[PDB]
Amino acid sequence: DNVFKVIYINPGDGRRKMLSYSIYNYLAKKKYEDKIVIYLIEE
Amino acid sequence: MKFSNITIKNFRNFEKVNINLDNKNVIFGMNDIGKTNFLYALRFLLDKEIRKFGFNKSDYHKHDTSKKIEIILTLDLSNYEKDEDTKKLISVVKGARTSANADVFYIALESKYDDKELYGNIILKWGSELDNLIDIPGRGNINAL
Amino acid sequence: MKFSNITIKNFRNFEKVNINLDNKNVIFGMNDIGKTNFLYALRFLLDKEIRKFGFNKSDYHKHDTSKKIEIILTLDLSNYEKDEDTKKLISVVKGARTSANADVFYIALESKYDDKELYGNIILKWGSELDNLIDIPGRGNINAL
Ligand SMILES: Nc1ncnc2c1ncn2[C@@H]1O[C@H](COP(=O)(O)OP(=O)(O)OP(=O)(O)O)[C@@H](O)[C@H]1O
Ligand SMILES: [Mg+2]
Ligand SMILES: [Mg+2]
Numbered sequence: 001d002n003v004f005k006v007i008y009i010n011p012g013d014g015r016r017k018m019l020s021y022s023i024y025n026y027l028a029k030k031k032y033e034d035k036i037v038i039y040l041i042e043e
Numbered sequence: 044m045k046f047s048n049i050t051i052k053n054f055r056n057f058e059k060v061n062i063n064l065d066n067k068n069v070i071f072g073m074n075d076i077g078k079t080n081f082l083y084a085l086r087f088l089l090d091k092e093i094r095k096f097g098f099n100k101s102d103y104h105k106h107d108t109s110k111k112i113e114i115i116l117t118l119d120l121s122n123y124e125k126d127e128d129t130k131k132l133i134s135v136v137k138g139a140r141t142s143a144n145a146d147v148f149y150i151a152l153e154s155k156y157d158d159k160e161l162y163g164n165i166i167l168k169w170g171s172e173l174d175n176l177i178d179i180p181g182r183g184n185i186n187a188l
Numbered sequence: 189m190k191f192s193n194i195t196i197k198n199f200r201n202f203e204k205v206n207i208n209l210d211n212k213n214v215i216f217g218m219n220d221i222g223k224t225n226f227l228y229a230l231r232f233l234l235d236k237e238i239r240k241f242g243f244n245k246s247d248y249h250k251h252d253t254s255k256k257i258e259i260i261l262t263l264d265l266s267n268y269e270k271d272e273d274t275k276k277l278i279s280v281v282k283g284a285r286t287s288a289n290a291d292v293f294y295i296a297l298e299s300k301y302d303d304k305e306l307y308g309n310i311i312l313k314w315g316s317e318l319d320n321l322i323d324i325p326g327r328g329n330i331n332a333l
Contacts, residue, residue, distance in 0.1 A: 014074030095240045095329055164328040182323070183309040184242055 005035040010042040044128040048117040053104045055080040087165065088114050088152050098154050098163025108156035118148040135187050136169055145171040189274050190264040197258035198249050200225050229259050233297050243299050243308030257299035266291045280332055285316040296321055
């Protein structure tokens with residue numbers, strides 16, 4: 001857990017999913033510089 | 044029996060829209076454009092599981108309650124002699140049709156807000172003329188639609 | 189002014205129950221016999237948000253579903269021009285009451301199972317006499333009660 005950080009993504013509507021992508025990419029850019037980030041996107 | 048038209052006034056992102064229809068309808072468009080809000084205007088008109096909760100403040104156009112919500116659906120009944128769904132309509136609405144060969148029918152919804160109760164009541168009407176809609180009879184939680 | 193009597197004629201646990209009441213009343217007893225179905229008889233009469241879902245098959249006595257659910261509440265309006273709540277009742281009831289009996293009020297609930305759509309519809313009536321109870325008028329989802 002000191003190496004890999006896993007971000008699992010599973011989803012009015014439409015823009016909330018893109019806003020969740022912006023939140024997940026902002027958290028991966030900010031809080032996870034020292035980790036290897038693996039995205040797991042489900043549909 | 045055929046769907047002909049729907050007219051939506053002051054419901055969510057629709058200020059005044061008029062859409063001709065049919066039996067088979069396919070709705071498409073962009074994101075945040077109102078495809079789900081178009082289908083929920085049919086849910087408030089015809090489905091009794093949503094109509095019993097009433098309207099909130101957020102169901103009004105740009106959130107102000109000084110304008111009433113009016114949704115009118117038009118049906119065509121020109122094939123009464125061949126279709127059984129037309130007789131399924133006419134056997135419940137046996138008093139409100141005006142002329143002897145009335146081929147149109149109108150099912151309408153009106154809603155006016157109450158600021159003290161903070162509640163939006165839904166009143167439904169039907170008939171054959173647009174200026175002579177009568178109230179739907181009902182007893183308890185069941186009306187005739 | 190004062191609650192006098194409740195009569196639960198058919199409900200979940202009750203076969204024929206007639207309880208004298210008052211203002212400020214406390215119900216107690218053993219476990220698993222009643223006394224939250226007593227409180228559900230008052231939520232089905234006077235609370236709109238419990239009343240709007242109707243009755244199921246399990247709300248009838250011993251799942252018999254051929255009897256009529258009837259819940260009658262008697263109110264005593266003997267004191268006039270002393271309490272504001274009696275004027276609050278009489279200004280909404282209009283003239284369903286009679287000047288021969290200007291002292292008692294009956295708010296009743298009746299329910300019969302449809303047994304085709306599988307739904308028990310709740311029809312509410314109010315009146316000054318126990319025979320000849322007329323229906324409570326309502327416009328949309330809003331009752332006069
Ligand atoms: N009361 C209202 N007044 C004004 N605009 C409203 C109101 N309620 C919703 N909207 C607008 O409608 C949008 C939501 O529309 P809706 O969810 O129907 O879109 P959609 O086309 O079904 O989206 P998608 O296909 O991307 O799921 C909101 O983002 C807002 O712009
Ligand atoms: Mg949508
Ligand atoms: Mg209990």
